Amino acid sequence: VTRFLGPRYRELVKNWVPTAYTWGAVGAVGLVWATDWRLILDWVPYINGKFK
Amino acid sequence: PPQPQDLEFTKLPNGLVIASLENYSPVSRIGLFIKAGSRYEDFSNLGTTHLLRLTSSLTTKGASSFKITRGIEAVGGKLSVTATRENMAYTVECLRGDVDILMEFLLNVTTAPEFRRWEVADLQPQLKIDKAVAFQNPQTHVIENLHAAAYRNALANPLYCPDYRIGKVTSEELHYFVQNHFTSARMALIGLGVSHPVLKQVAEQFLNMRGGLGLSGAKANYRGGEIREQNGDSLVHAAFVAESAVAGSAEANAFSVLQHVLGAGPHVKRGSNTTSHLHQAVAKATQQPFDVSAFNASYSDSGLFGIYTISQATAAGDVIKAAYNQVKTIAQGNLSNTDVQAAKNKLKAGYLMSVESSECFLEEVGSQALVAGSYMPPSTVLQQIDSVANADIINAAKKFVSGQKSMAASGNLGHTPFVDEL
Amino acid sequence: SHTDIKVPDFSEYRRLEVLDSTKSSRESSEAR
Amino acid sequence: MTPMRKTNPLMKLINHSFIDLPTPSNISAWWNFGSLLGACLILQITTGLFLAMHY
Amino acid sequence: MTPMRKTNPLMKLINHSFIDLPTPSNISAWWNFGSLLGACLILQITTGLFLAMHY
Amino acid sequence: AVSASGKWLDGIRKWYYNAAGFNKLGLMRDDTIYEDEDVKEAIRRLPENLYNDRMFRIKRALDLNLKHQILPKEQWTKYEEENFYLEPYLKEVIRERKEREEWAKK
Amino acid sequence: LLAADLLILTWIGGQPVSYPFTIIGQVASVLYFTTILILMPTISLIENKMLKW
Amino acid sequence: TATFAQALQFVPETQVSLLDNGLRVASEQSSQPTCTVGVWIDVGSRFETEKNNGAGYFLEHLAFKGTKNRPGSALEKEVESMGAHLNAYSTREHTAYYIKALSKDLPKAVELLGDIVQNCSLEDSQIEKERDVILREMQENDASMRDVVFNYLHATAFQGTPLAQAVEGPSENVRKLSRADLTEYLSTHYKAPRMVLAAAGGVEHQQLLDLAQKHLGGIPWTYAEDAVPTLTPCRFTGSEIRHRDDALPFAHVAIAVEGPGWASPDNVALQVANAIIGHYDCTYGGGVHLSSPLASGAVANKLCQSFQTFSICYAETGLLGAHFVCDRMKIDDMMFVLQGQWMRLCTSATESEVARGKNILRNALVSHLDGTTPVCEDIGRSLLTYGRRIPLAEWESRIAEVDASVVREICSKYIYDQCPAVAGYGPIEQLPDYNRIRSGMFWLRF
Amino acid sequence: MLSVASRSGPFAPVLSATSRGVAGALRPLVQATVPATPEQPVLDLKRP
Numbered sequence A: 001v002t003r004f005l006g007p008r009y010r011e012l013v014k015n016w017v018p019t020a021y022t023w024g025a026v027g028a029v030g031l032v033w034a035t036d037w038r039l040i041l042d043w044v045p046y047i048n049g050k051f052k
Numbered sequence B: 001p002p003q004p005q006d007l008e009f010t011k012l013p014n015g016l017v018i019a020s021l022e023n024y025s026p027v028s029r030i031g032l033f034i035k036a037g038s039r040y041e042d043f044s045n046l047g048t049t050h051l052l053r054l055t056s057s058l059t060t061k062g063a064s065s066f067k068i069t070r071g072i073e074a075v076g077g078k079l080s081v082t083a084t085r086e087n088m089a090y091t092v093e094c095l096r097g098d099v100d101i102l103m104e105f106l107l108n109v110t111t112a113p114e115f116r117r118w119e120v121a122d123l124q125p126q127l128k129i130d131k132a133v134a135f136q137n138p139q140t141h142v143i144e145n146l147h148a149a150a151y152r153n154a155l156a157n158p159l160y161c162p163d164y165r166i167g168k169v170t171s172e173e174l175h176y177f178v179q180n181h182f183t184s185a186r187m188a189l190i191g192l193g194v195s196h197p198v199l200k201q202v203a204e205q206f207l208n209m210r211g212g213l214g215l216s217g218a219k220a221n222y223r224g225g226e227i228r229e230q231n232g233d234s235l236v237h238a239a240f241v242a243e244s245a246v247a248g249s250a251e252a253n254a255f256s257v258l259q260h261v262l263g264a265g266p267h268v269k270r271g272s273n274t275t276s277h278l279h280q281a282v283a284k285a286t287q288q289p290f291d292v293s294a295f296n297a298s299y300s301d302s303g304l305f306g307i308y309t310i311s312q313a314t315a316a317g318d319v320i321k322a323a324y325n326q327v328k329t330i331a332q333g334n335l336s337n338t339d340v341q342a343a344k345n346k347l348k349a350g351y352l353m354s355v356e357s358s359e360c361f362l363e364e365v366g367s368q369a370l371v372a373g374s375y376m377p378p379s380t381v382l383q384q385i386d387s388v389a390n391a392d393i394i395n396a397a398k399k400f401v402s403g404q405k406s407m408a409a410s411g412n413l414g415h416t417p418f419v420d421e422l
Numbered sequence C: 001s002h003t004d005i006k007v008p009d010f011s012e013y014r015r016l017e018v019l020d021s022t023k024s025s026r027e028s029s030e031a032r
Numbered sequence D, E: 001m002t003p004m005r006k007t008n009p010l011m012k013l014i015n016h017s018f019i020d021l022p023t024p025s026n027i028s029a030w031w032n033f034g035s036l037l038g039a040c041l042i043l044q045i046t047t048g049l050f051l052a053m054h055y
Numbered sequence F: 001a002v003s004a005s006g007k008w009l010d011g012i013r014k015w016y017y018n019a020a021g022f023n024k025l026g027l028m029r030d031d032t033i034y035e036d037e038d039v040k041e042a043i044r045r046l047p048e049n050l051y052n053d054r055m056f057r058i059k060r061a062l063d064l065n066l067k068h069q070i071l072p073k074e075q076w077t078k079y080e081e082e083n084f085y086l087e088p089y090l091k092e093v094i095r096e097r098k099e100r101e102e103w104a105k106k
Numbered sequence G: 001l002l003a004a005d006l007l008i009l010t011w012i013g014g015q016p017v018s019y020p021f022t023i024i025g026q027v028a029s030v031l032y033f034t035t036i037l038i039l040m041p042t043i044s045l046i047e048n049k050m051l052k053w
Numbered sequence H: 001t002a003t004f005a006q007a008l009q010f011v012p013e014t015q016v017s018l019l020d021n022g023l024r025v026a027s028e029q030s031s032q033p034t035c036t037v038g039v040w041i042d043v044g045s046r047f048e049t050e051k052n053n054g055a056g057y058f059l060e061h062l063a064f065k066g067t068k069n070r071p072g073s074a075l076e077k078e079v080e081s082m083g084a085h086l087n088a089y090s091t092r093e094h095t096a097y098y099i100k101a102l103s104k105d106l107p108k109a110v111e112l113l114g115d116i117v118q119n120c121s122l123e124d125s126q127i128e129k130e131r132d133v134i135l136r137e138m139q140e141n142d143a144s145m146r147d148v149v150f151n152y153l154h155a156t157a158f159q160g161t162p163l164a165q166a167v168e169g170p171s172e173n174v175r176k177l178s179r180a181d182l183t184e185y186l187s188t189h190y191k192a193p194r195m196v197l198a199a200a201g202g203v204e205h206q207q208l209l210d211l212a213q214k215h216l217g218g219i220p221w222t223y224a225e226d227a228v229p230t231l232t233p234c235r236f237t238g239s240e241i242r243h244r245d246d247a248l249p250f251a252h253v254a255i256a257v258e259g260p261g262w263a264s265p266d267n268v269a270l271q272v273a274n275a276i277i278g279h280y281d282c283t284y285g286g287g288v289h290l291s292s293p294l295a296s297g298a299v300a301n302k303l304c305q306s307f308q309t310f311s312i313c314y315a316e317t318g319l320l321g322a323h324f325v326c327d328r329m330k331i332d333d334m335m336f337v338l339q340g341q342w343m344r345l346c347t348s349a350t351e352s353e354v355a356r357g358k359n360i361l362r363n364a365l366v367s368h369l370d371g372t373t374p375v376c377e378d379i380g381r382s383l384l385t386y387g388r389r390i391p392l393a394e395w396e397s398r399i400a401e402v403d404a405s406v407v408r409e410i411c412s413k414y415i416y417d418q419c420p421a422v423a424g425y426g427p428i429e430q431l432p433d434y435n436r437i438r439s440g441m442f443w444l445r446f
Numbered sequence I: 001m002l003s004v005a006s007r008s009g010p011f012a013p014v015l016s017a018t019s020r021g022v023a024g025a026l027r028p029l030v031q032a033t034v035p036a037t038p039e040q041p042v043l044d045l046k047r048p
């Protein structure tokens, strides 16, 4: 593909980057929460208590 | 700022007239004026001009349709095509720094048009939309009938394509009209923000295009017929024209003064035109809503002076009789001096006020350049307009009374008179 | 004649912050 | 560009059936038991399906 | 008076898919397996259902 | 330019043309191209006579394929008589698309 | 040729693990992928060239 | 030879000068042989109540019917023997009387103008004639559809506020007014320093100031009983009004959100955004997949007949939105596209579009000022709006500050997740309910 | 004076890529609103 290049498609990506980061963060936390992943969860100040 | 500049004229050997002025406005304007008009078509091809002026945005050999619109749109400029029976005027507006770009398009559209047949076919249905919008206002239909009622061949040609020709205009007819009517000698070019010397060399490109003279038309002959319509509208329109003088003649000035004596144009808003003779004559004839004024259309071949009266269907006869009787009294020699001076003041104020706008000023300069090629300053207009004498106006009125009349009237027509009984 | 139309009062349904026909609504929209 | 829910084949049916079909404004709670029935049907399948894994 | 397969909703679908479906005339046998696949499925289903009553 | 290589190129192209069977059905080369949106617009710009001829030859080819028949030898299309009628229109349409895409990125 | 390669793959699947079958299977597998991913697009462009498209 | 910002510096400036009574006099001189002289007054329907809703419009009808010095037809006879043009207009926040004439008649024009604003005879028989005239003109306005939907939008967006009611006022109200309410309205409002005299064209400020003192110097500036007509802010309401009439050809929706007052910088940026959306019509040449995004999509399924974007500004508040016409069956699709364009501006704005918007804005500013009358109007409206006349150079400087990021923030400030006001008059069965319209003001993807 | 745009003669149909088309001329009109009730109904054709 070649049409996707140009000064403006770069700008469009820049604007949407913050939204992409937030959505990725939402997915990661959601996955951890749903799976009760002890590995990451053990470093949570309050949630760790659940684990006994 | 610098001193007030003047306009420079020049005539290339081809015959093209070039005129430029150097103001200091930040917006620049360029115009191309062509002697082509609806009067140069014959019966074989009709509606050609009406479609031609819609093609200004079509692709050319040197520029694509996509490029023209996008480029003009991005710069923020405009391009318009004013049209009339005598002339066609391309015009473009932009900023000072973008002139060299837009002229490239303007030149192209009028020098190397490429009338793609499929593009023309797709553009055909637009003709109906344009025609309908114009006819939404009944005044358009009355005049186009009026011209078809007073002229036999040349100026009777409608500005809009006839209904039956809408789907049958071809690109070959477009091409044929262009070659025979876009000749250089028939053209003139006007610029306002641009400098004269650069205008010479930008125009040098098309000196290898067109050339010589084009296909001449025919002198418009007068007939004197009527064209009634009998539509369902409650408010009947009419028209009462007669042969007049020719555009740009001493007699033409007398007719201009004559119409303004008869209250041609309203001045004060939400107010009765007491000074107008026609409104006074009609006020004591009808007590229901009415509108009346005089008409004046001067062309190179001939002119037409007359009267237009909107009125109720029942009172149409009375309105017309009062207006016509008023003109007879003027023709009999009953004309006061004060009215002459008041009418002249109206004329001069109208002329200067109309030319005040830059767009109208460019239009007036182009119209004058085509016929003569020598600009005539407004002061000279004033001296010409002040030379009118009373006897001249009386002679003008007498000529209108004695001349044969053409009448076009749309409306209910239940009580509207006919010619030969008015 | 269309100028004779006017919205009936909704005072019995409006929220407290918009109950006055003089205070601007922009200062409470984000809160509401 | 018009909405895709009025052009995609699968989305036309969903739009007609759920999103946009006109309905009376005044239908009472009695008109709510039809949707529940299907929901219950859905609930009855899944539960039974799991029971079938051991019966 | 008009055909009844152009009014009933259940017959509109059958008319579209089966009876008045515009189809190229030169399609060869290769275009038959499509139908056969469904037919075979319909066979399997019924055959299996009867085996389930004793498995 | 190369003569022997050019003649070999012409010979192999003619061999490939005869290997493709569309000449056996009276079809021209431009009739076999896959009809994408660009081709659809290009066909829309054809004059009536070429459009009418194209439709009829397609019908005849479909009819022949119906009965697994072949057009007589004498009526097969010849490698040198073919006219690429659709080439100019398709080229213009493609160029217009490229211009639109080029503008759209900046 | 691709169809024949699939036939070879099926036949090899029906045979025990041994020297000739193992090597033949590897050659068939690589040939399978290469034909689809490489050969088909290349020849398609070549045919477009001989047709003066 | 001259650059854009370089040509801006050759525009003559306006000279201001106060009179003793507090009247402001402004003038812009040129070499033209004509001039436009008018008076602008900060009086409109916003200063009226239910008892005198139509007073401003009614007075406009009697402005040139006669005065003490020139009774009856004397006033128009003098105006027309001069070849000048006398015109007037009103609004919810301003009123104006202006004359176009030759510079050679500057003195007399001012005299008449002063006479019309101080000595307005209110003969009763004239009042009866104007009653019927206004009654008929109201019927005509009903025929116009745009007026109807723009009055509806005000009525619903300013519910319970003086800005809601129309300039003309209820028909029932115009038939009960007397020569006592009109005099009260005239005496209470028309006086300095609210008045602003303006004269653009071939007029000299010195001459304009001596003439004003001769005639306009007598206007009082003191209120009786100190009954000062104080202004109050106006509340904005997010609501909808639906007047259904299927006999009409086309649906006629109108939507708008709340916007800044006239005297906030942000409005400039908003104007740029309105240039990106643009306007469309059925008579425009080309543009099919060839013009701005909303107009390019406007002809793919032939959705709209004509849409325009507006930005109405009042003191401390205003309206920002988009007005469009459409066929009965394509109402929802047109609204869908419009809302998408607004949201795209709020989130994804490129500089290329912004540059086009800035260029369009420059052309409109410069081209609009062409002519004397537009110049005089700008002077009067600015002096009553900002207290000054922003020069072109300043306008260019502020525009140049606009950037894609700036547009994003401002549009998000006023457009995103805000409750709109909707007005629809026609076959509007397909118009989506408020809830659906309100849910289309944000993006679940953002 | 040789341009009819400043006269009450024929109309001048105009067109523009961006602007709309409107005719001109100065034959009687507009001043019928005061005395009469000429309505302005919207119809098949719509343009601002």
Ligand SMILES: COC1=C(OC)C(=O)C(C/C=C(\C)CC/C=C(/C)CC/C=C(\C)CC/C=C(\C)CC/C=C(/C)CC/C=C(\C)CC/C=C(/C)CC/C=C(\C)CC/C=C(\C)CCC=C(C)C)=C(C)C1=O
Pocket (backbone or CB within 6 Å): D017, D018, D021, D031, D032, D034, D035, D037, D038, D039, D041, D042, D043, D045, D046
């Ligand atoms: C009031 O207004 C309203 C209306 O009027 C306007 C309306 O009209 C409606 C609409 C009406 C209604 C709902 C009412 C009912 C009407 C309907 C059309 C719908 C009819 C319903 C149905 C057909 C039923 C739909 C389904 C149900 C219960 C689901 C059953 C089927 C399934 C897929 C479901 C999923 C089961 C799952 C996944 C199993 C769970 C197990 C999972 C993780 C483990 C699964 C593991 C596997 C497969 C593993 C496989 C492994 C393999 C091969 C091994 C591979 C190994 C390798 C190595 C490769 C409404 C609501 C309404 O309100």
Ligand code: HEM
Pocket (backbone or CB within 6 Å): D041, D044, D045, D046, D047, D048, D049, D051, D052, D055
């Ligand atoms: C509308 C749908 C259904 C209804 C009304 C229904 C109803 C019932 C009822 C009343 C029982 C008796 C259970 C008891 O008395 O304890 C039962 C048992 C059972 N059903 Fe369902 N059922 C439905 C769907 C299904 C489906 C889809 C499955 C499997 C795919 C299923 C599998 C079972 C099983 C395994 C049992 C045995 C449970 C037991 O013995 O307690 N059912 N069903």
Ligand code: HEM
Pocket (backbone or CB within 6 Å): E030, E031, E032, E033, E034, E035, E037, E038
């Ligand atoms: C598994 C069960 C399947 C069923 C019941 C099924 C059903 C059908 C039927 C009945 C047709 C019409 C046949 C025709 O008109 O030629 C068809 C066409 C088609 N099928 Fe399937 N199919 C199945 C699997 C597949 C698979 C695995 C593919 C893989 C690509 C596929 C791709 C297609 C395609 C592309 C067509 C259109 C052919 C054409 O337009 O000429 N199908 N299918």
Ligand code: HEM
Pocket (backbone or CB within 6 Å): E041, E044, E045, E046, E048, E049, E050, E051, E052, E055
């Ligand atoms: C496309 C659909 C299906 C396919 C491809 C399929 C395929 C198969 C195959 C290959 C076997 C083993 C045959 C053997 O070992 O000789 C089998 C077994 C079985 N299938 Fe399916 N099947 C399908 C649908 C169904 C359905 C709908 C049922 C519903 C009850 C079903 C019930 C069974 C049963 C009961 C057996 C046991 C066979 C036995 O006891 O010998 N099958 N299936």
